[PDB]
Scaffold this active site. Structure first.
Site, PDB file in Angstrom:
ATOM      1  N   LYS A  78       0.937  -1.400   0.073  1.00 51.94           N
ATOM      2  CA  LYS A  78       0.002  -0.007   0.134  1.00 51.94           C
ATOM      3  C   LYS A  78       0.740   1.346  -0.186  1.00 51.94           C
ATOM      4  O   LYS A  78       0.534   2.257  -0.663  1.00 51.94           O
ATOM      5  CB  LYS A  78      -0.918   0.142   1.250  1.00 51.94           C
ATOM      6  CG  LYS A  78      -1.929  -1.028   1.170  1.00 51.94           C
ATOM      7  CD  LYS A  78      -2.582  -1.276   2.660  1.00 51.94           C
ATOM      8  CE  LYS A  78      -1.362  -2.226   3.694  1.00 51.94           C
ATOM      9  NZ  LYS A  78      -2.019  -2.462   4.832  1.00 51.94           N
ATOM     10  N   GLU A  82       1.304   5.094  11.309  1.00 48.95           N
ATOM     11  CA  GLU A  82       2.084   4.292  10.624  1.00 48.95           C
ATOM     12  C   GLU A  82       3.665   4.642  11.128  1.00 48.95           C
ATOM     13  O   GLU A  82       3.742   5.329  12.157  1.00 48.95           O
ATOM     14  CB  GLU A  82       1.993   4.784   9.119  1.00 48.95           C
ATOM     15  CG  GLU A  82       0.717   3.929   8.508  1.00 48.95           C
ATOM     16  CD  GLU A  82       1.115   2.423   8.505  1.00 48.95           C
ATOM     17  OE1 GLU A  82       1.988   1.782   8.262  1.00 48.95           O
ATOM     18  OE2 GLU A  82      -0.202   1.665   8.687  1.00 48.95           O
ATOM     19  N   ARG A  83       4.490   4.095  10.296  1.00 48.83           N
ATOM     20  CA  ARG A  83       6.061   4.024  10.706  1.00 48.83           C
ATOM     21  C   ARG A  83       6.546   5.606  10.620  1.00 48.83           C
ATOM     22  O   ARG A  83       6.198   6.307   9.642  1.00 48.83           O
ATOM     23  CB  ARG A  83       6.811   3.270   9.796  1.00 48.83           C
ATOM     24  CG  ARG A  83       6.459   1.899  10.092  1.00 48.83           C
ATOM     25  CD  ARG A  83       7.281   1.136   9.069  1.00 48.83           C
ATOM     26  NE  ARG A  83       6.940  -0.489   8.712  1.00 48.83           N
ATOM     27  CZ  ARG A  83       5.666  -0.720   7.924  1.00 48.83           C
ATOM     28  NH1 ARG A  83       5.159   0.138   7.160  1.00 48.83           N
ATOM     29  NH2 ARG A  83       5.604  -2.107   7.805  1.00 48.83           N
TER      30      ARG A  83
HETATM   31  N1  LIG Z   1       5.252  -2.382  -6.884  1.00 42.87           N
HETATM   32  C1  LIG Z   1       6.164  -3.396  -5.962  1.00 42.87           C
HETATM   33  N2  LIG Z   1       7.074  -3.914  -6.364  1.00 42.87           N
HETATM   34  C2  LIG Z   1       8.019  -4.936  -5.966  1.00 42.87           C
HETATM   35  N3  LIG Z   1       7.689  -5.068  -4.700  1.00 42.87           N
HETATM   36  C3  LIG Z   1       6.913  -4.420  -3.736  1.00 42.87           C
HETATM   37  C4  LIG Z   1       5.988  -3.660  -4.662  1.00 42.87           C
HETATM   38  N4  LIG Z   1       5.055  -2.947  -3.810  1.00 42.87           N
HETATM   39  C5  LIG Z   1       5.622  -3.402  -2.658  1.00 42.87           C
HETATM   40  N5  LIG Z   1       6.500  -4.561  -2.648  1.00 42.87           N
HETATM   41  C6  LIG Z   1       6.782  -5.266  -1.455  1.00 42.87           C
HETATM   42  O1  LIG Z   1       6.225  -5.246  -0.393  1.00 42.87           O
HETATM   43  C7  LIG Z   1       6.937  -4.930   0.841  1.00 42.87           C
HETATM   44  C8  LIG Z   1       5.969  -4.010   1.644  1.00 42.87           C
HETATM   45  O2  LIG Z   1       5.397  -2.990   0.993  1.00 42.87           O
HETATM   46  P1  LIG Z   1       4.514  -1.629   1.735  1.00 42.87           P
HETATM   47  O3  LIG Z   1       4.029  -0.675   0.916  1.00 42.87           O
HETATM   48  O4  LIG Z   1       5.376  -1.329   2.915  1.00 42.87           O
HETATM   49  O5  LIG Z   1       3.297  -2.677   2.318  1.00 42.87           O
HETATM   50  P2  LIG Z   1       2.343  -2.323   3.442  1.00 42.87           P
HETATM   51  O6  LIG Z   1       2.061  -0.837   3.206  1.00 42.87           O
HETATM   52  O7  LIG Z   1       1.311  -3.355   3.567  1.00 42.87           O
HETATM   53  O8  LIG Z   1       3.406  -2.524   4.788  1.00 42.87           O
HETATM   54  C9  LIG Z   1       8.142  -4.232   0.242  1.00 42.87           C
HETATM   55  O9  LIG Z   1       9.279  -4.328   1.005  1.00 42.87           O
HETATM   56  C10 LIG Z   1       8.594  -4.531  -1.206  1.00 42.87           C
HETATM   57  O10 LIG Z   1       9.484  -5.683  -1.047  1.00 42.87           O
HETATM   58 MG   LIG Z   2       2.241   0.511   4.756  1.00 42.00          MG
END
Ligand SMILES: Nc1ncnc2c1ncn2[C@@H]1O[C@H](COP(=O)(O)OP(=O)(O)O)[C@@H](O)[C@H]1O
Ligand SMILES: [Mg+2]
Ligand SMILES: Nc1ncnc2c1ncn2[C@@H]1O[C@H](COP(=O)(O)OP(=O)(O)OP(=O)(O)O)[C@@H](O)[C@H]1O
Ligand SMILES: [Mg+2]
Lengths: 485, 310, 310
Positions: free
Chosen positions: C154, C180-181
């Site tokens: 997300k 969030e973080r």
């Molecule tokens: N478009 C993308 N391409 C490749 N990997 C992705 C992509 N989006 C997310 N990821 C993977 O998902 C992990 C977590 O993404 P994040 O946005 O932090 O998820 P959330 O918002 O659910 O915590 C990242 O470390 C990455 O490796």
């Molecule tokens: Mg997130």
């Protein structure tokens, strides 16, 4: 006529009304603060959690079965805090900060609160320095930076703790050296474990000469739920000491699963509304405020750091459960360990597909980036092919056996890249999988003995140059030929 | 000091006191009854009143009936005279062989050995059996999960581990019958006499039996493991032996804790279990360890409910 | 008029007044503290007493401590001076750059746009992502939801949408870091200074930052979504600009509600959630919409507990 005894005025003291379900209802303590430490008549500590109009509900840090009705509770004065400093190094303590190793008093000067809020946006800065575990599979695929939060997660007996132990043993390299910037002070917090296990753990660190830069907070299974609930925050405050004073520190919560059930006990006894798996609404907030304190401080605020390695126990590999997903959404990456890989003997058993660390990737050596650049995706695609492309299987079996590593034996970053270089570049394709382990031992003991200059140039430059590449090429090539026949 | 019963709701019994309010865990002797009825104090409700859990049936109790404080938790007979004998949760003999002529007494509730007392070295317990020693060996001060019921020589294995540990290591054993069938307790008792691990003629018995089966209330069943544990703690702490503590079975200890917590009115945890699941187990299992003086190795039977390990 | 604190428990604090009892929403300043602790009145318990919710940690609070009434809800700065700055939940600057000088001061609480004020435009928004534009494309001035579990993508998706859409846009933007973080706020802040959208020297910043991250208490995280919302509303109502709102994560607004709900003395709803789940979200969400005068495009990241959309 003698004057009446006014030693028990209800302003600064109070008597217990009731006690049984973890909480102690206290009549009095009018001037007491919220979340303030309080002392019972039996030398037992407690925290003023609930401040009601006609009473004060107190959380008892210890065995609440010692407290009776009419027992006199007294104010300490200060908010719940713990001893803090370098005097805690090489000492085993409980959640309150009292020594349990039988090596006399701590003799600490400073003290810090357990419930301090984490640094905001300005004091923080992206992680830069690498936090070296000394494990090949970790440092290559899932590297950790200083100030990062990296979840260690998996089923029971998958090698979760062993990663943290080897990480602590590996720091001896830097701590017994000239470079003050590269030093790392460790903090192992035990929550819900057995005392025998913790006693065995400190001996292992003592034998490896690792205790003298390590603090050990212990809240074992026999200790009350509030002590297990408190233990992480106490150790976190001890880590913040280094972080704030321009020093880098590591902390391991082993484990937050056993903390969650301890905090669930308290909440269910408080009669608070339960939710998923009977956990209260603020089980996320419980771990969030803890882990946020692990951060990387900029030069303006000392330039120190606090690296967190929280542990989580999953049931039957269910990473989609309530508590894992909460800790996954807090940390900056995961290291998932599988029962399948661990049962086969592939140790450390790390799931390359699920395990990630994007924040720690930026804080990685250029030497490791070269040898283990493509290795991330190669191992992922290798696990897919269950039922030209045959060469993928010819590499996958070697790199898996190459990443296998014995317990209580870390490796330097320059020593690791030399081993990974052999397999990934294709100098171990025509060789038996069983020969990979013995080859490593013979190869590593040779290069560390003879070719110190090669390893030194790799460490000093932090990169494999053209001269180092050609030099390193002719070691693995010629050493193999002798090893073969 | 003397107290009076103010409320009786099932196994839960409230008792009011004038001066001396007894602490939590203390055993209270109820007066004016045929058999010995013990109440264990759990909470302090306030206004000089405490809530207790009954160790036997609460029928015949009247509001105002007298209750005396023992001044300590449930004390039981401990020593070499417990070997060859059966005793209930509160230390009374239930084998009709007269009183247990013991020298010392020990409370069921006890704090676990401190961090300094812990044995840092992990030593192996030689069972003498080839399947065990080689593939899945027993650790001194460890806890082993026995799986399976009838038709696989379960009781024979139990009796052999008692014999071999006593023969080789010179350590006595203890069998805590926790919440299983009283029929099975009768079957084992006579098999042990047949084998020789129990001897009714002379004092050469190797087992001290401590039964509290499913016919007894949840208050009793919850504290039976602690009673048997305390018998095993004598041979470790006083005689300095490598003790062998059997618990048949550990699920019933967990079930009894869930039932007691439910009757008190505590809001249940996940899957209907008590909030104090980890602590109740923790405070018992931590007492089973290696120490400077000796050790207690425990072979605990386990019934996995719904064949679900999670 | 001054008021005394009668009871404290977590985020919830009960305050008693002699005369001049403050209405709901009104912020209350606590005395004798270093940092500005604000209590928001949620209920009226009776007997000249009011139950409030604290916007910061309640450690150090004593019963009988003085509490002054501001005479209005939580008021925050709004205008072009909020652009390129970082605000907290109660309007204070948290970027070490002095005060936010503004003429207008909007309250975080406000009524939703009336039925006659609503717009009905449905022009497609080209994000550039193949899956979005093809199957479920977003609309200009519309409400966009990014549902996802733990670590699915997300934050990566919303950063991409900001990278694609927010750079190629005439009007302003507003980011709201809800629970969030904190390091992601630091990553975003410096990345926006690097790109140029947030200018430190000039007064031409295109983004306004608001943060009440997971390190903050529940009361802060429960009200920070409304704080950042109010910043975007100023540009919509008074100026009449096309705003790009960004919330991450909107679940933390509702998650924070459940924590305080327990302490507010309500009967819990399904899965331990607050009974006012729909109405609390309703009053908040209905404000985020395109009116006749202005326009707001909201891309809201939504967390999914245990990968359960139900
Ligand atoms: N478009 C993308 N391409 C490749 N990997 C992705 C992509 N989006 C997310 N990821 C993977 O998902 C992990 C977590 O993404 P994040 O946005 O932090 O998820 P959330 O918002 O659910 O915590 C990242 O470390 C990455 O490796
Ligand atoms: Mg997130
Ligand atoms: N790399 C390795 N090689 C060989 N054996 C290992 C390795 N890592 C761990 N082990 C062994 O596997 C056992 C389980 O490991 P460990 O206790 O670290 O896992 P864990 O997840 O911490 O278990 P628990 O959560 O139950 O404590 C240990 O007794 C250890 O001896
Ligand atoms: Mg472990």
């Amino acid at each position: 006529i003698l004057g009446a005894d006014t030693s028990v005025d209800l302003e600064e003291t109070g008597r217990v009304l009731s006690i049984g379900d973890g909480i102690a209802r206290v009549h009095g303590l009018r001037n007491v603060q919220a979340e303030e430490m309080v002392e019972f008549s039996s030398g037992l500590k407690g925290m003023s959690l609930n401040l009601e109009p006609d009473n004060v509900g107190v959380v008892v840090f210890g065995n609440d079965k010692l407290i009776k009705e009419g027992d006199i509770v007294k104010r300490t004065g200060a908010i719940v805090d713990v001893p803090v400093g370098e005097e805690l190094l090489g000492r085993v303590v409980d959640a309150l900060g009292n020594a349990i190793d039988g090596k006399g008093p701590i003799g600490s000067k400073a003290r810090r609160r357990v419930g301090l809020k984490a640094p905001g946006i300005i004091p923080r800065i992206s992680v830069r320095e690498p936090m070296q575990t000394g494990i090949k599979a970790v440092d290559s695929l899932v590297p950790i930076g200083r100030g990062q939060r990296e979840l260690i997660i998996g089923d029971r007996q998958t090698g979760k703790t062993s990663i943290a132990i080897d990480t602590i043993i590996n720091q001896k390299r830097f701590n017994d050296g000239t470079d003050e910037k590269k030093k790392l002070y460790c903090i192992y917090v035990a929550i819900g474990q057995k005392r025998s296990t913790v006693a065995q753990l400190v001996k292992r660190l003592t034998d490896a000469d690792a205790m003298k830069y390590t603090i050990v907070v212990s809240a074992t299974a026999s200790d009350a739920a509030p002590l297990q609930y408190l233990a992480p925050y106490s150790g976190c405050s001890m880590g913040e000491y280094f972080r704030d004073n321009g020093k880098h520190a590591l902390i391991i919560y082993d484990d937050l699963s056993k903390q969650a059930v301890a905090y669930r006990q308290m909440s269910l006894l408080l009669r608070r509304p339960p939710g998923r798996e009977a956990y209260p609404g603020d089980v996320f907030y419980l771990h969030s405020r803890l882990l946020e304190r692990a951060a990387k401080m900029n030069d303006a605020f000392g330039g120190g750091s606090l690296t967190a390695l929280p542990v989580i126990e999953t049931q039957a590999g269910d990473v989609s459960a309530y508590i894992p997903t909460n800790v996954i959404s807090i940390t900056d990456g995961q290291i998932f360990l599988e029962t399948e890989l661990f049962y086969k003997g592939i140790r450390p058993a790390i799931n390359v597909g699920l395990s990630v660390s994007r924040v720690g990737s930026a804080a990685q050596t250029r030497a490791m980036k070269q040898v283990a650049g493509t290795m991330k995706l190669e191992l992922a695609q290798y696990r897919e092919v269950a039922a030209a492309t045959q060469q993928l299987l010819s590499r996958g079996v070697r790199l898996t056996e190459l990443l296998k590593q014995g317990q209580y034996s870390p490796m330097a970053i320059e020593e690791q890249v030399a081993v990974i270089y052999a397999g990934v570049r294709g100098y171990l394709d025509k060789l038996e999988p069983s020969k990979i382990t013995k080859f490593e031992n013979a190869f590593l003991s040779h290069v560390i003995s003879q070719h110190q200059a090669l390893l030194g140039k790799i460490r000093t430059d932090g990169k494999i140059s053209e001269e180092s590449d050609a030099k390193l090429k002719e070691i693995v090539t010629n050493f193999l030929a002798g090893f073969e026949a | 000091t003397t107290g009076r019963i103010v409320a009786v709701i099932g196994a839960v019994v409230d008792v009011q006191f004038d001066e001396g309010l007894p602490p939590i865990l203390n055993a209270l002797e109820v007066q004016g009854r045929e058999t010995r009825l013990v109440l264990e104090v759990a909470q302090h409700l306030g206004e000089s009143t405490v809530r207790t859990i009954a160790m036997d049936g609460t029928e015949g109790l009247v509001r105002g009936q007298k209750v005396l404080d023992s001044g300590a938790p449930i004390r039981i007979p401990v020593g070499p005279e417990t070997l060859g004998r059966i005793m209930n949760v509160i230390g009374e003999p239930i084998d009709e062989r007269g009183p247990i002529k013991t020298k010392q007494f020990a409370a069921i509730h006890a704090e676990a050995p401190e961090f300094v007392e812990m044995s840092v070295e992990q030593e192996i317990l030689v069972t003498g059996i080839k399947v065990v020693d080689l593939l899945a060996p027993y650790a001194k001060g460890g806890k082993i999960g026995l799986f399976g019921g009838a038709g696989v020589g379960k009781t024979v294995l139990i009796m052999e581990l008692i014999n071999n540990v006593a023969k080789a290591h010179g350590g006595y054993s203890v069998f805590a019958g926790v919440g299983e069938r009283t029929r099975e307790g009768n079957d084992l008792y006579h098999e042990m006499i047949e084998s020789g691990v129990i001897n009714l003629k002379d004092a050469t018995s190797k087992v001290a039996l401590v039964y509290g089966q499913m016919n007894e209330p949840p208050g009793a069943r919850a504290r039976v493991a602690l009673t048997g544990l305390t018998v095993a703690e004598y041979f470790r702490d006083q005689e300095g032996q490598d003790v062998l503590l059997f618990i048949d079975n550990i699920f019933r200890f967990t079930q009894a804790g869930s039932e007691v917590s439910a009757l008190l009115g505590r809001i249940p945890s996940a899957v209907g279990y008590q909030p104090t699941l980890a602590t109740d187990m923790g405070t018992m299992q931590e007492r089973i360890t290696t120490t400077k003086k000796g050790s207690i190795t425990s072979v605990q039977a386990i019934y996995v409910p719904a064949d679900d390990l999670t």
